[PDB]
RNA sequence: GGUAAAAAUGGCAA
RNA sequence: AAACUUGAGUGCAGAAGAGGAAAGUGGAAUUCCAUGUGUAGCGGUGAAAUGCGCAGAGAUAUGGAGGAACACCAGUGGCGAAGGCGACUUUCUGGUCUGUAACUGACGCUGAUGUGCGAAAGCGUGGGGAUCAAACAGGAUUAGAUACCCUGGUAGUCCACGCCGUAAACGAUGAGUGCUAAGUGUUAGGGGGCCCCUUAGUGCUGCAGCUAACGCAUUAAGCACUCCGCCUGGGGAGUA
């Protein structure tokens, strides 16, 4: 059965991005909305919409394709997994693509990027790398 | 071709109905293939059990 | 049905016995018992004429109705009992009028089953009908050869014969031996197979148990002296040393047919065993 | 059973006979059961012959 | 089992009217079906295919009984004595 | 459960005997918790092939409703024994 | 439908 | 700790099926046996011969006995966890699919060790024995022929109950879940106007992507997460 909803989200994004789909819809969760909001904030995705469904909600993500159809998201990777959870200290926070990419971190200060985590000096679980 | 049973809205085949069954058997008594008859898959099965039941009761010939 | 003994002794090793689960009553009906003193293979002259019979456990004879001639009255099987005089088990049956008789217990006969004899009886195990009334392909037992004499054929444990065809006054039957023969249609037969089928499988186990059954030791002819047996004598162990193996009374005993010629039954026998 | 028609050649009747035998497929059946073919082989022949058809 | 007998079992063990999915109802019907196939298997001992269905039913009953004991021990204890399963 | 039984009686049977036969067998089909809904005589018909060296047979069809198969069992047992009934078949539906 | 039947062997290197 | 219904089950209304077990009933054919007709061969092969026949074969006609398997239907058709399952009838019994949305409310997934099932050959006990057929025996072929081919033929092939536990037991592809172009055929449904839509199977073709290549491609060998089994040069050796 479904074991990693976050990983599913990132794969759906990866798959839709490969085929250059404009939008994708996925089942919603609070964590997945937060991840989506960072991606829009960092300019990886155009827009995030939430639709109430009387179940768990639906997230609609609109993907960004640059001029010449160049993809703004090149790759996404799940770091912490149900099989093996990965945590880092603020000092040890990883840089993705030498700052060209981002790391999404779950911290006691909320789900945030690696830059904010180093700034706030708060470490946590490394959810994923997006570049 | 066309399925007789579908066309004529017949949903049950009686082994006792020899006259119907004689149309779907060859001159040698062999059961005709559904390609030649145009019978549907569901009705080829129904008809064929009926032919075997009819042959048992000597209503139709084995050969 | 077969119980296998553990090898606590060499005597009990490989010995098996019947469980006797089918037996319902352990004690016989007193009215139907008669004395049976042992003959030990000795005739009216007092001389041994059949070898290897002697001693064995004392036994009482149970009167059995092989005739099955009480017709039009239903009988209910009271019990299945052990009979020492035969391989099969026997069933005590009580007729409606209150007459009690013993019959050979067929396979699958049960206490409370109703058994009837006659022309109008149904084809069900334990019913006795004339061979005329019995359909082809029915397995039957306790078959008479002469009408009214009583059943003589297919009486042993697990015995049966099959009705093959009808030929006027005679009915064709296939016997357990494999012989197909004609029997007079008037002769009666009982429906079903004789019970106690596991009898043959019993491993006697030890010499003593044979002695309980009144079997005395068989001495081979080859370990006798010449004056005793044609296989007798020779220095050390000897092979048969003759064109044919011979009986103790000097007749060839391997393959030689002993059926007497010019017998009335010869016309009745269609196919030999 | 082909029966010779009135004013019909035996050779003409033979033509009718040959065709009836072909439709019956008795010849086809005879050749198949000349030698035993293992169950798996029989199933394969049925499938690929149908694929041809 | 017959739909009649099944319906009787649901009414006996239904937690509320209109309840058809409570562990109690599901366990009870499963208990009946297991017994019926066990009966079939006594006569037909070499019906391996049917026994496999029985094995799946036993496991489904076990998993529901596990869930019920986890959730309500009293409800569990009452069900097991009523259905005579243990 | 409703069962439709079809049996063929030999063509050489006497009419009075045949009437007695059908009465017995149709009686059997109503013996145990069973009700004969209908019984019909198709009559003498040419058999497609010879059965028991007979080229014709008297066909009888009975429809019976029961909660058990005891009556249908008793029919089949007695039909086997009978020399009058050359063929028989029981169909649930 | 076919089908003619038989029909062996030959150092490692370069 | 308290909720929720999407997963997973249950109910309700439908659907198809060589799924399984046990009885019973058929028809075709083979073999044998019995008679009638009849006559000098039949059978077999590359060619022969062994064999069978003249003590009447083979062939033809009719009758009987017995065992085994079910033509046609029949189809990358159907069903099953796999092995497998094909005449028909009845009884008992397992699973699956569609729709609906009564109910339950994460009750799920995987699965070491366990525990069962498991083609064929084989083994034990009892039964059976038509056909075919290891071994074996003739004939032939050949340099030889412990083979291929021919005539025979035992175990075995069949049934019951135990045992064995293995196959290129294969899709050489572990299970679960989600996601990712299309086109076309077919099986069992559902819905709406022959057409369109849809669910679950089963095929073919073919993007993206993947791959050493061959190829795979919504029935992944693509993109992902969970759990299990397994691999680390060849031989020795699946041996001690
Ligand atoms: Mg003696
Ligand atoms: Mg001496
Ligand atoms: Mg002497
Ligand atoms: Mg001597
Ligand atoms: Mg010596
Ligand atoms: Mg060389
Ligand atoms: Mg085997
Ligand atoms: Mg050979
Ligand atoms: Mg292996
Ligand atoms: Mg599909």
F79 sits in which H/E element: helix F70-81
User: Please, is F69 exposed, middle or buried when counting C-beta atoms within 10 Å of its C-beta (0-12, 13-18, 19+)?
Assistant: middle
Domain of residue A19: give its range.
1-73
Other beta carbons within 10 Å of D22: 11
Report if CB E68 to strand H is under 7 Å: no
User: Contact at 8 Å (CB) between A9 and A61?
Assistant: no
Same domain, A9 and A66: yes
To one decimal, the resolution in angstroms is: 2.2
Same domain, C152 and C68: no
Q: Which residues contact C40 (CB under 8 A, 6 or more apart)?
A: C48, C53, C54, C55, C214
- For chain D, the straight-line distance linking the first and the last C-alpha, in angstroms and rounded, comes to 29
Query: For residues F58 and F6, what is the distance between their CA atoms, to the nearest angstrom?
Result: 11
Nearest Cα neighbor of F1 from F73, F77, F82, F88 is F73
Domain of residue C200: give its range.
195-270
Q: E40 is written with which tokens?
A: 């079939």
Same domain, C76 and C45: yes
| Strand H bases, protein C-beta under 7 A | 4-13, 16-22, 24-28, 63-66, 71-77, 80-83, 85, 87-95, 102-109, 116-118, 125-127, 132, 161-162, 176-181, 186-189, 208-209, 222-227
User: Contact at 8 Å (CB) between C110 and C100?
Assistant: no
Query: For residues C21 and C87, what is the distance between their CA atoms, to the nearest angstrom?
Result: 15
Query: For residues C11 and C206, what is the distance between their CA atoms, to the nearest angstrom?
Result: 5
Query: For residues F54 and F58, what is the distance between their CA atoms, to the nearest angstrom?
Result: 11
Which 8-state DSSP code applies to residue D35?
S
Q: A17 is written with which tokens?
A: 């991005």
Asked if the Cβ–Cβ distance from B58 to F51 is below 8 Å, we say: yes
Tell how many helices (H) and how many strands (E) occur in chain B.
4, 0
What's the longest Cα–Cα distance across chain F? 37
Query: For residues C106 and C191, what is the distance between their CA atoms, to the nearest angstrom?
Result: 8
Give the CATH superfamily of F3-92. Ribosomal protein S6/Translation elongation factor EF1B (3.30.70.60)
Nearest Cα neighbor of A50 from A63, A41, A61 is A61
Angle of CA points C240, C242, C246, to nearest 5°:
75
Long-range contacts, stretch F72-81, CB < 8 angstroms, 24+ apart: F72/F3, F72/F5, F72/F29, F72/F34, F74/F28, F74/F31, F74/F32, F75/F5, F75/F25, F75/F28, F75/F29, F78/F25, F78/F28, F79/F7, F79/F25, F80/C135, F81/C123, F81/C135
Dihedral sign of CA atoms C138, C143, C147, C148 in order: negative
Angle of CA points C261, C262, C267, to nearest 5°:
105
C170 sits in which H/E element: strand C170-174
Same domain, C38 and C20: yes
Same domain, A8 and A62: yes
Report if CB F70 to strand H is under 7 Å: no
State the method. Answer: cryo-EM
CATH of the domain at C76: 2.40.50.140
Interface mutation vs chain B, best among F2, F48, F63, F93, most B CBs within 10 Å: F48
Q: Which nucleotide is nearest to A1 (CA to C1')?
A: H177
The tally of domains found in chain C comes to 3
Distance from CA of F87 to the nearest CA of B (A): 7
Chains B and A: 3 or more CB pairs within 8 Å of each other? no
Q: In the listed set C194, C215, C244, which residue is the last one of a domain according to the structure?
A: C194
Other beta carbons within 10 Å of A91: 8
State the pairing for strand pair A45-51/A58-63.
antiparallel
So where are chain F's domains? 3-92
Query: For residues A53 and C272, what is the distance between their CA atoms, to the nearest angstrom?
Result: 89
Q: In the listed set C168, C194, C220, which residue is the last one of a domain according to the structure?
A: C194
Q: In the listed set A73, A97, A119, which residue is the last one of a domain according to the structure?
A: A73
Residue where the block lists tokens 């019979």: C53
Same domain, A111 and A123: yes
B15 interaction partners in chain F (CB closer than 8 Å): 91
The tally of domains found in chain A comes to 2
What's the C42 CA to ligand 9 centre distance in angstroms?
68
Query: For residues E42 and C234, what is the distance between their CA atoms, to the nearest angstrom?
Result: 63
Which 8-state DSSP code applies to residue E39?
H
Dihedral sign of CA atoms A20, A22, A25, A26 in order: positive
User: Contact at 8 Å (CB) between C160 and C139?
Assistant: yes
Same domain, C38 and C22: yes
Taking the stretch 1-40 of protein chain E, residues with Cβ within 7 Å of any atom in nucleic acid chain H are 3, 6-7, 10, 15-16, 18-23, 25-26, 29, 33, 36-37, 39-40
Same domain, A28 and A61: yes
Residue where the block lists tokens 């049976």: C36
Q: In the listed set C171, C194, C217, which residue is the last one of a domain according to the structure?
A: C194
Query: For residues C210 and C202, what is the distance between their CA atoms, to the nearest angstrom?
Result: 12
User: Contact at 8 Å (CB) between C224 and C190?
Assistant: no
User: Please, is D23 exposed, middle or buried when counting C-beta atoms within 10 Å of its C-beta (0-12, 13-18, 19+)?
Assistant: exposed
Other beta carbons within 10 Å of C189: 28
Chain F touched by C119 (CB under 8 Å): no
Three-class secondary structure of residue A19 per DSSP = coil
User: Contact at 8 Å (CB) between F52 and F9?
Assistant: no
Q: In the listed set A73, A90, A105, which residue is the last one of a domain according to the structure?
A: A73
Query: For residues E60 and E55, what is the distance between their CA atoms, to the nearest angstrom?
Result: 9
Distance from CA of C135 to the nearest CA of F (A): 6
Residue where the block lists tokens 């020399």: F83
Residue where the block lists tokens 């009870």: E28
Q: C18 is written with which tokens?
A: 């019947």
Q: A121 is written with which tokens?
A: 């000096």
Three-class secondary structure of residue C186 per DSSP = coil
Tell me how far the alpha carbon of residue C126 is from its chain's centroid: 17
Chain F touched by B60 (CB under 8 Å): yes
Residue where the block lists tokens 């939430």: A50
Helix axes E3-13, E23-43, angle to 10 degrees: 140
Residues in chain C: 273
Residues with CB under 5 A from ligand 5 (ion): C 236
Q: What is the DSSP string of chain D?
A: ---PPTT--HHHHHHHHHHHHHHHTHHHHHHHTSS---HHHHHHHHHHHHHH-
Same domain, C134 and C224: no
Cα within 13 Å of Cα(F26), Cβ side: 16
CATH of the domain at C239: 4.10.950.10
Nearest Cα neighbor of A130 from A9, A59, A39 is A39
CA distances from C95 to C29, C68, C114, C119, C213 (A): 15, 12, 9, 17, 34
**Positions of E strands within chain F:** 2-9, 34-51, 54-66, 85-91
């Amino acid at each position: 059965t479904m074991t990693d909803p976050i990983a599913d989200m990132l794969t759906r994004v990866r798959n839709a991005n490969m085929v250059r789909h404009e939008k994708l819809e996925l089942p919603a969760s609070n964590i997945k909305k937060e991840i989506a909001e960072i991606l829009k904030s960092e300019g990886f995705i155009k827009n995030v919409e939430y639709v109430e469904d009387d179940k768990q909600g639906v997230l609609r993500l609109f993907l960004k394709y640059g001029q010449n159809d160049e993809r703004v998201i090149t790759g996404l990777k799940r770091i912490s997994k149900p099989g093996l959870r990965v945590y880092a200290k603020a000092s040890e926070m990883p840089k993705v693509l030498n700052g060209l990419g981002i790391a999404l971190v779950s911290t006691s200060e909320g789900v945030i990027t690696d830059k904010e985590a180093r700034k706030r000096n708060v470490g946590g679980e490394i959810i994923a790398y997006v570049w | 071709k066309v399925c007789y049973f579908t066309a004529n809205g017949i949903t049950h085949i009686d082994y006792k109905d020899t006259e119907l069954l004689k149309r779907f058997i060859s001159e040698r008594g062999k059961i005709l293939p559904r390609r030649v008859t145009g019978t549907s898959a569901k009705y080829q099965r129904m008809l064929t059990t009926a032919i075997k039941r009819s042959r048992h009761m000597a209503l139709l010939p084995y050969v | 049905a077969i119980k296998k003994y553990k090898p606590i002794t060499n005597g009990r090793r490989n010995m098996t016995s019947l469980d006797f689960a089918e037996i319902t009553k352990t004690t016989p009906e007193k009215s139907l018992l008669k004395p049976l003193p042992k003959k030990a293979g000795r005739n009216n002259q007092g001389k041994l004429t059949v070898r290897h019979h002697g001693g064995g456990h004392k036994r009482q004879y149970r009167v059995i109705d092989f005739k099955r001639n009480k017709d039009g009255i239903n009988a209910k099987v009271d019990s299945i009992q052990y009979d020492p005089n035969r391989s099969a088990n026997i069933a005590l049956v009580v007729y409606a009028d209150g007459e009690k008789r013993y019959i050979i217990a067929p396979k699958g006969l049960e206490v409370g089953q109703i058994v009837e004899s006659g022309a109008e009886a149904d084809i069900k195990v334990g019913n006795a009908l004339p061979l005329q009334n019995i359909p082809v392909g029915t397995v039957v037992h306790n078959i008479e050869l002469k009408p009214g004499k009583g059943g003589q054929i297919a009486r042993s444990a697990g015995a049966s014969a099959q009705v093959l065809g009808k030929e006027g006054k005679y009915v064709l039957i296939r016997l357990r031996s494999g012989e197909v023969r004609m029997i007079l249609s008037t002769c009666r037969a009982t429906i079903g197979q004789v019970g106690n089928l596991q009898h043959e499988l019993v491993n006697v186990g030890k010499a003593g148990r044979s002695r309980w059954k009144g079997i005395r030791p068989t001495v081979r002819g080859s370990v006798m002296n010449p004056n005793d047996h044609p296989h007798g004598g020779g220095e050390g162990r000897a092979p048969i040393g003759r064109p044919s193996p011979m009986s103790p009374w000097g007749k060839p005993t391997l393959g030689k047919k002993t059926r007497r010629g010019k017998k009335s039954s010869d016309k009745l026998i269609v196919r030999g065993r | 059973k082909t029966v010779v028609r009135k004013n019909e050649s035996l050779e003409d009747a033979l033509r009718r006979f040959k065709r009836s035998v072909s439709k019956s497929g008795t010849i086809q059946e005879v050749r198949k059961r000349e030698f035993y073919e293992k169950p798996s082989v029989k199933r394969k022949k049925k499938s690929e012959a149908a694929r041809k058809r | 089992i017959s739909q009649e007998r099944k319906n009787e079992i649901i009414k006996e063990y239904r937690v509320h009217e209109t309840d058809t999915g409570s562990p109690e109802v599901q366990i009870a019907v499963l208990t009946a079906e297991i017994n019926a196939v066990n009966e079939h298997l006594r006569t037909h001992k070499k019906d391996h295919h049917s026994r496999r269905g029985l094995l799946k039913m036993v496991g489904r009953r076990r998993h529901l009984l596990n869930y019920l004991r986890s959730k309500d021990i009293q409800r569990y204890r009452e069900l097991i004595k009523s259905l005579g399963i243990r | 459960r409703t069962y439709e039984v079809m049996y063929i009686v030999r063509p050489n049977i006497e009419e009075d005997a045949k009437k007695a036969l059908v009465e017995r067998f149709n009686g059997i089909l109503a013996t145990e918790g069973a009700e004969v809904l209908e019984a019909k005589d198709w009559g003498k018909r040419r058999l497609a092939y010879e059965i028991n060296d007979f080229k014709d047979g008297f066909y009888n069809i009975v429809r019976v409703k029961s909660d058990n198969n005891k009556a249908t069992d008793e029919f089949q047992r007695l039909a086997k024994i009978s020399d009058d009934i050359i063929r028989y078949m029981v169909i649930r539906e």
